Every structure is written in C-alpha cells, then in structure tokens.
DNA sequence: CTGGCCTGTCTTACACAGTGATGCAAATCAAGTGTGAAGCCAGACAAAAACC
DNA sequence: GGTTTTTGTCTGGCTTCACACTTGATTTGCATCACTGTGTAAGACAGGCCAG
DNA sequence: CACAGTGATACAGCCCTTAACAAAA
DNA sequence: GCCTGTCTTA
DNA sequence: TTTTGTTAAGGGCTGTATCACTGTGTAAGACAGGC
C-alpha cells in the first residue's frame, strides 16, 4: 500500500500522476499544485463520507484559530455541574494534547465570573433610594443583614445570603443586555434609543422542603428561596409602549434569578420576616425613582413594577397576616366563607389588598368597638396577625381543570347511582357505582383509575367522549342532556384560563366567561340539586369568581402557574455537593453565585450556539 | 494588545539607533536601547502607554 | 475496545471448568444462581467479569508499558519466552452504599503487581507498579450489593471466581502483542484481605477468638508468653484438612478438646489468602505498648500491685497533660497513626523521663525506644 | 438464684477527601530581522529484495 | 533465473520556522488554604450461659 | 403520582453522486 | 358544629 | 467565459428524541391527640 511505503517510494509510485497534475495546474489554474491537490483531497475525503477529518484540514489550511473565550468556559462549567478540579483537570489535558489552548485557566473564569454577578457594573438612582446604600460595588451581602447574634438575644439558627435588590436587578438587565437590543431591533426601534425602559419584575418565594444529605434518623433541614424574574420590558415610543422583551419561559427555572437563598422553615414566621424585612425595604425604595445604567455605551433610564405573583396559597396567607387554609375565609382574594362560597357560586369580587389586610390587623389589635373574639374574627375577615409582603396571589391553569374534573368525577359517580331519584344510597351502593365507572372509563377511554387526584386525569375526563361514555350508564337521557350542557359550559370556559394570552387567542371566551359560568352554576344549583353540601374549594371558587377579575389584571393565567420550582430544590442540592466549599457560611453563598450564574441569559445563549 | 512604555518608545527611537550603527544586530540593538532607556524623563512613554491601555479595554 | 472480552487469547491446556469464548464481558454475577419462589431467596444483585478475561483485558491496557520496559532491560520487542505476571487479588466490603437503610457492597478486585520475562535463565523484571495500593490499579472483578457477613450469598458468589483463578492456576495463556504471540503464566497472591475477612474465607473463628494469629497457631495466652519464637504455620490446605477433623470427630474428643484440636478452625475455608500486616497497624500497636508503659511508669506500678481504677486514671491524666506541655500531644480517646508517630520518638521518652523519679528506668526506656 | 466473664451492637473519635479561593513564582507577550538548521528538488541508475 | 518493487547515491539553491535579547506588565502553573461531613474502626457495654 | 435524568437505542435529516442546461456575472 | 401535625402512599 | 443552482433516486454519519426505569420531592388526604 501507498502509506506503507516511506517517502521516496511513495513519490515513485506516484511521479506519472504528479507529472499530469504539473501539466493540469499549469494548463487551467495557474501552476498551483498544492491547491490543485488540497481541493482533491478535500472532495475525495467528502465522497468517502469523512467529511469531519476534511473540515478539520480545512480549518488548519485556513489557519483559523479555535480558541473558546473565558466566558464560553464558564457557561460550560456551570451549565455541567464541574467543579473547579475537574474543570482543570479537562483543561490541563486539552492543552497537553492538542498543544493548543482550547480551554481557558481557571483563573480567566473567575474574572468572567465578576462580569455576570451583581457588583460589577456601576448605576445611579434618581433620586437616590430611601435607606439604601449608593455603593454599586456590593456582592453577596449576609443575609441576616445585621442580625443580631449575641447569647443573650433570641438564638440565630439559620445561615443565609442574598443579593442587594438594586444591585441584583442591574446584574439582571445588564445580562439581557443583548436580548434589549436585538428585541429593539427586532420592533424596528433604534439601538440608541434610551427613552423610559419598564420592567415588569415578577417576585415569588417558596419553602425547598427538605434539603438534607444523610447517610434512618434524618434531621430535616428546610430551606427558603427568594427570586425574581423580568417578565416583560417595554420602551414608551409615542403614546404607545412597545415590548421590546417578553421571557418565553416564565416558570422556567432558567430565569429565575436567586435574590435570597436561607436555610430556615418558611413557617418560622420570626426568622421569615427578620431575614426577608430588608429586601422588601429595598424593593418599596425603588418603587419611587429611576435607575439610570450604560448599556451599549448610551445611558439608558429604567422604571419598575414588582408584582409578587410568585407565592403559593400557603405563603400569600403567611405574608398576608391572613389565617391557615382550614379556615373558613377561603379565598385570599375576597372576605368569603367557605360556607357563603358554596351557596353564592359566582358572584364575589377582588375586594382584599394589603392595604385593607394591614388595617384588618389594627382593627383586631386595638379592637375598637369592644367585641367578643367572634364577633371581632367576623368584623376583620381572619386577617388576626400583620401583614408584611405585597402579594398578587392568582391561579395557574391546573387548579382549574383538577376542581372541575373533581365535580365532574363526583357527578359521574352519582349520575350512576340515579341520586336525582334515590336520596340514600349506602356505602356499598356508591362503592359499586364507581367502580362501575372505573371499569367503564378503562373499557371505553382506556382510562386508568386513580386513587388520587391528578392533573392529567383532568385533561384526559373533561372530554365530551368521556360523557357519552358515562352516559352509557345513565338510564334518563334528560340527564344526558344535563350532562351534555354541563359539559360544553365547562369546555367554552377552559380556554381562557389555558391560553397564554386570551385576550388574543380566545377573545369571545374570555368575554363569554362570566356569562358561561352564570349558566355552569345555575345548571348545577337546578338540575344538580343533590351536589350540595356546603362544601367548596379555593379551586373551584377562584374558577368560578375570579377568573375573569384576575385576566383584566394580569393578562392571563397559565403563565402565573405553580408548576416549575418543583426543580428548585434538586437544583440547590446539586449545587451544595458538588459546586460548594464545606463549611456554613461559605456553602451559601457559593451556592448563591453558582445559581446566579446558572441563570445568566448570556451563558445560556453560549449553552444554545448550535440553534 | 497595547504596548508598554517602553516598547513605543523603542520603536520611536529604532531609527536613531539604526542610522548611528547599521549592522548592529537585534540582540545589540535591543540590549543598548533597554540599557540606555533603563539607566534614564520617560513619563510621557507612560503616559502614551495609559492611554492606549485603556483605550483597548474600552475594544469589546 | 478497553472493556474484557475483545480480545482473542488462548488458554493451554483450556481451562477446566471454564468456557473457551473470548468474547464474553459483563456477566450475571449470580452465575445461575436460582431465583424461583422455592429456592433460597436472593437479596442481592451483583455484576462481574470471568477471571481470565478480566487477565487479557489488563494486560492488553499495559501492553505498552511491558514493550517499553523490555526494551528499558536492553531486550528484544518481539521476545515471546514466557512471561509471568504476579497478581495480588483483594477483597473489602464497602460499609453503606446506599443513596437516601443500609446498602452494603463487597469489591472483589485485582493488581498487576509485576511482570517478569525469561531471558536464558535470568527473571528480569519487564514491569512492576509504582503505587500498589492506589485506587487507580485496582482492577475490579467483581461488584456485588451484599453484606460480607452474608456467608451464604458471599460463597454463592465468589465460588465461581475462585474456580476460574484454581483454573488459571496450572495453564499458560497465549495473547497477540504488537502482532507477536506472546505467552504468559499468572501467579495469584490474595494478600488484600483485611483480617475479618480473611478468617471468613479460611474457615477460622472471629476475631475474639483466642486463636488470635491467622499465619500460626497461638493462642492470646501462648503468644503473650512467648512473644517472639513463632512461625509461619497455617496455609489453606491445612484448615480444609482441620475442618475435615472437626467435622469428623476422628478421636471422639469433647467439644473443647476437638477445638483445640483443630486451633480453631471450626468451618470450611472456600479462599486461599496470604494474610499479611499493615506497617500502620505495626506502629500502632508499639505505641500502644509504649503509652502504657509511660502511664504504668509514671505511677509506678511495680510498687502499688493492688492500685485502683482511679489510681491509674490520675497517672493517665499526668502522663496526658505533661506530654500537651512538652510534645504538644491532644490527649486521644482512640489510637490512629498520627498519635504513633508522634509518640515514638526519642525526645518524647526524654519528655516522659522528665516526670520518672528512678533514672535505672530512663536507661530502660530509652534502650526500648 | 446471682455473678464474673466470654460474645455482637453501640458510640463517637478521627483521618481526609475535596470544595472554591488564594498567593507567589515562572512563563508569556510583543517588536524588531538576520541568521542557522532542516527536508526537498532533479535524473540516470544499482543495491538489496522479494514476485512469477 | 527474469520480472517486479523499495531505497538508496550525488549536489547545490529554495522555503519555512526557531532563536537571538530586552522590559515589565499580564497570564499560567501549581501548591496551598480553611473547613467541615463521612467512612471507618477503636473503643465501651449490657447480656445471657451456667455454676456455687 | 410525575418527572428528572441515566445509558442505550431508533429514527430522521444531512450533503452528496451520476449529466446537462444555464443563469448570474 | 374542630384543629392540626403525622403518616401513607400515589 | 467563469461561477453556482438544479433536477431525480439514493447512501452513509450525525444529532436528538425517544426508550425503559426507578428515586424522589411535593402534596393530597387520612387520622388521631388535645393525659
Ligand atoms: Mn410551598
Ligand atoms: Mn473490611
Ligand atoms: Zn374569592
Ligand atoms: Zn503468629
């Protein structure tokens, strides 16, 4: 074979071919024999299929150089969980095989690390911020803030971190810098242009349930997250305010910038409100000023609208003053009873605030009017502790669809047993009548029975094929009509709690709504008599009284959901074992800047290149 | 990259040294003008040098 | 390419017992072991490689560090006489695997420890490891999710190994290296083997036993006396013929006379060890001795026989804070190396002799220093 | 009917694995260019070698 | 033996890097820090067989 | 439960490969 | 016409 | 006169979309003490 033999040889075997070429080269491309030959290297290594070795000669024919940037090294590192040690063993062992530095040290990282942390870029604040610090140059700050800690005050339990609020939302938006511009661009506005950004921030907090590692007898520790994400922001050109960015992926854990992470019990109110105090102050002082911030070189002016929407039913009732979720007070949008929810189906309105909550609270401290603890419960709502958060509590798209399945289900099952007839069934008859419709719905929609509710057990019940289903086993076909309408009442609604802006995509549903779950509710309370026992849930009242209330003032539903921080926790435990020095104070805010950094849009956009 | 002081000052003063002395070679001509440069009235090279280092910061 | 069972290799005579393909990887490590609701019930799950294939698969990997140390003895690369290769074969429970109820794992594993090459009649040493005991050679056989103190299962899944090694022990094994033949003869030394472990697979009693030594067959009281004049005495082929004795209660002795009999060894051996010492476990016991003959000597011993706990507790304490005062010494609850190492040196004995009123008793603690 | 005394659980000591940060020594870069070392070219041709 | 190959031989004049030397401000290499959780195993200990 | 996240695996999409015209330049 | 952790699994 | 596109049928690497599968977090109910 030609590549057996040395140099000499191989030229031998080759000198009539070499000769040809000489005279084709010098014939048609000018005597250049090396490119003559490169290019028909190159063609036979891309008919051969090796199109990978023929790139590569290409590339070192080019001579152009792969180097990946300091800050493509660190998306890597953080986006696969590498600490510091197996990063330079990776780096190292590039190096010494190609010879070349395709990896950055591990020293270039960290700088390109103080880039996408808060504390790096300089801001001003017009007028400067009641009671905050003017320094630009403030990082991970502790976030005891001052706590006290000396034996004689209560006992500190709990290590947590956080950043400067301000200081955070600059960090923030000089990340998305070039998602700004390219969204300018993309709305045909102008680079240059600085008129007044608005940034709609979306605050949220949520308990991380247990985070132990354990090698039994585990000591439980809880741990709390407080974030933010940028929703939205908008340039006023005109009367008019363009959106420039919107995040396409709202409950992503992606955007979901740490702000406080501690470790303590979201239900030990004093350290809750002791560690979390100081970022609500920052957030009230920015509400009355403008930041002004460089951003391609042109200062730019930003306004802020915090919304904390981002707090499940047990929290907004913790911050809110209001009492535990046994309790009569149902709704933490409105003053009703679970007893007055379920008579009165539709008509309620948003009438609490955290205004009325705080003036609730000094109603029932200072009980004006002499009242027994009754009478003084009933005149304050269950507002019986202080407030100390603004919260938005809304409804994501599930609640809805599993509080009408639940009904659905219950109906299903009592429609089987001709309850409409008989009043007293005893519970061998109604155990029958479900499994009867257990059976049924795994013989006709090939529907698994569950012991428990579920989400996609609703989407997969609510579907006029399931009625004519259960239908099957309903003996009066006045109550499959019933059931029909029911039914289409439910399936006219669902849209405007799922879609992602029904003002858009559904606008005869959402303007329907209130209408439909009129006629939902005096279907049930005429023709659904039996279904009434006093009882309701918070589901099923928000579904049916607030869901038109919420859209007008959030826009929607579906993306104001629950449904993601559920990743959360794994998240922050990876980062505690294998990104994180072992000691308390450290661990946390090692923690802190690695989820800051997995969260950056810069590095996710190196993390997405191929796309 | 931006050079040092002392590296626009040796280009500044290559051609003096090289009309004095023709053949002297890259060593030599290197070695006096480190040497005389070293033993001296150079703030202005500084000076120069400042500048055009933060002039390649600002170069994203 | 780097997992066993890619390459092709011979074994002459084939081995007994042992399939002839070569094409075999990862393995049941149950090897048939029946699972079926009336058998025993089988808690574990295991994976493992055949012996000599896990062979060829290590030494394909050093292939070019036995090329390069031939020719590093001035030899020929393509020199075929046969090589023999020195394992050291090793077995450790590995405490709680589990990911959260305790999940233990036991590791039977392998060390290449040294490749010799026959030239005329000189054994010259063509490769040896640098680090013996690193994780890094440590070549594992096989991984099994049970508790080395799970007899039954151990033996149900180690048998077969050992038959394959018993196999390998009396054939010579022929391999392709740098498209020569080549041809090499294994000797096996199962020196990893901690001493727990050790008296499981050799058929002898727990560690409280007052057999206490696993290579003779003193007894605690005998070698306290004696102390120095022992031999190496057990080898596995005796305690399979021991537990033959007991089993068979040839003499029709009682049971503390068939003990003493048979030193000890009351079940089976199913693993030919060769049980060794840890250098740390030499240090530690000397300094043991010597902390308390510091304390004894300090107290003065010989002088009060009937002294009392507390007696001896108050010479414990002297001796503890005089050695934190002079050699900086953290009283210990528990003896580690560090202690030892610190403990036995010369300066520590002028530091203890410092609170001995007798100097005839210096002379003798620094001679035994 | 109650010891001493020969045995498997219990209880922490204790080394150390390995985290991101740190700190200091040593490459490294960047410019000038004239060298020297190095594999290659061409053509008629014969050694040391395997193929019928 | 003929018929096929590998692999040399002799020059130079070529082209393409590496080295040469300096300065001092960056960039890399590498060992180290402080620090706890976790495994491992050295202890202590209650316990129950059996005898006075 | 739902889903995260493992290594293995199945499937789709990739740029071509024969001749010829020919459109942009 | 109860409250509220603990526990069990889905 | 010099560069590319293009047709049709069809052949390998490569990229990602699943497989199957279990641990695990979260939460939905069950249930029991308030001696
Ligand atoms: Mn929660
Ligand atoms: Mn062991
Ligand atoms: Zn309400
Ligand atoms: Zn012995």
Redesign the pocket.
């Known amino acids: 074979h030609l590549l057996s033999?040395?140099?000499?040889?191989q030229?031998?075997?080759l000198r009539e071919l070499k000769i040809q070429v000489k005279e084709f080269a010098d014939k048609e491309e000018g005597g250049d024999v090396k490119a003559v030959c490169l290019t028909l290297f190159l063609?036979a290594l891309?008919?051969r299929?090796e199109?990978?070795q023929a790139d590569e000669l290409e590339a070192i024919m080019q001579g152009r150089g792969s180097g990946l940037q300091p800050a493509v090294c660190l998306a890597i590192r953080v986006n696969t969980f590498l600490?510091?040690?197996?990063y330079h063993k990776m780096?190292?062992t590039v190096?010494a095989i190609t010879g070349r530095?395709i990896f950055?040290?591990?020293?270039?990282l960290?700088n390109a690390e103080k880039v996408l942390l808060p504390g790096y870029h300089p801001f001003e604040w017009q007028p400067p911020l009641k009671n905050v610090s003017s320094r630009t140059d403030v990082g991970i700050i502790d976030g005891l803030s001052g706590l006290a800690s000396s034996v004689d005050e209560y006992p500190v339990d709990t290590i947590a971190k956080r950043f400067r609020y301000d200081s955070a939302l600059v960090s923030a938006l000089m990340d998305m810098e070039e998602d700004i511009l390219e969204g300018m661009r993309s709305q045909d506005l102008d680079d240059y242009l600085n008129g007044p950004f608005t940034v709609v921030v979306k605050e949220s907090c949520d308990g991380?349930?247990?985070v132990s590692?354990?090698?039994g007898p585990a000591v439980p520790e809880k741990a709390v997250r407080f974030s933010f994400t940028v929703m939205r922001i908008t340039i006023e050109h005109g009367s008019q305010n363009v959106k420039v960015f919107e995040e396409p992926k709202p409950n992503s854990e992606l955007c979901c910038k740490p702000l406080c992470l501690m470790l303590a019990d979201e239900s030990d109110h004093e350290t809750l409100t002791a560690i979390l105090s100081p970022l609500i102050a920052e957030r009230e002082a920015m509400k009355s000023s403008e930041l002004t911030l460089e951003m391609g070189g042109i200062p730019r002016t930003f306004k802020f609208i915090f919304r904390g929407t981002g707090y499940?039913e047990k929290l907004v009732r913790e911050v809110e003053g209001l009492e535990?979720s046994?309790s009569v007070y149902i709704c933490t949008l409105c003053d009703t009873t679970r007893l007055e929810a379920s008579q009165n189906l539709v008509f309620h309105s948003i009438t609490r605030s955290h205004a009325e909550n705080l003036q609730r609270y000094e109603v029932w401290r200072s009980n004006p009017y002499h009242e027994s603890v009754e009478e003084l419960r009933d005149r304050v709502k269950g507002v019986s502790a202080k407030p100390f958060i603004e919260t938005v509590p809304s409804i994501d798209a599930l609640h809805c669809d599993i509080g009408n399945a639940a009904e659905f289900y219950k109906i299903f099952q009592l429609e089987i047993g001709e309850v409409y007839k008989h009043p007293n069934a005893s519970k061998e008859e109604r155990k029958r009548w479900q499994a009867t419709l257990d059976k049924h719905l795994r013989k006709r929609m090939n529907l698994?029975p569950?012991?428990?509710?579920?989400?996609?057990?609703a989407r997969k019940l609510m579907t006029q094929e399931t009625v004519d289903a259960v239908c099957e086993l309903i003996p009066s076909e006045e109550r499959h009509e019933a059931l029909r309408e029911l039914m289409d009442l439910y399936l006219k609604m669902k849209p405007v709690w799922r879609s992602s802006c029904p003002a858009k995509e559904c606008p005869e549903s959402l303007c329907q709504y209130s209408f439909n779950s009129q006629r939902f509710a005096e279907l049930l309370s005429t023709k659904f008599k039996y279904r009434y026992e006093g009882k309701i849930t918070n589901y099923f009242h928000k579904t049916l009284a607030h869901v038109p209330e919420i859209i007008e003032r959030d826009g929607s539903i579906g993306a104001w959901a629950?449904e993601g921080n559920?990743?959360?926790?794994?998240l922050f435990r990876?980062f505690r074992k294998?990104?994180?020095?072992?000691?308390?104070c450290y661990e946390m805010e090692?923690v802190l800047?690695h989820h800051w950094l997995y969260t950056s849009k810069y590095l996710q956009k190196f993390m997405n290149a191929?796309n | 990259?931006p050079?040092?002081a002392?590296?626009l000052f040796?280009?500044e003063y290559?051609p003096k040294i090289k009309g004095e002395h023709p053949g002297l070679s890259?060593?030599d001509?290197?070695?006096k003008l480190?040497?005389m440069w070293?033993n001296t009235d150079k703030q202005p090279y500084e000076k120069k040098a400042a500048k055009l280092?933060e002039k390649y910061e600002k170069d994203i």
């Open positions: 033999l040395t140099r000499r040889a030229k031998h075997r063609l891309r008919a299929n199109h990978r600490s510091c040690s197996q780096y190292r190096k530095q950055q040290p591990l020293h270039a960290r991380m349930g247990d590692e354990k090698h499940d535990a046994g698994k569950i012991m428990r509710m579920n989400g996609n057990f629950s559920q990743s959360g926790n794994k990876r294998m990104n994180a020095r072992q000691s308390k090692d800047k191929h | 990259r050079p040092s002392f590296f040796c280009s290559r890259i060593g001509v290197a070695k480190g040497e070293n280092k």
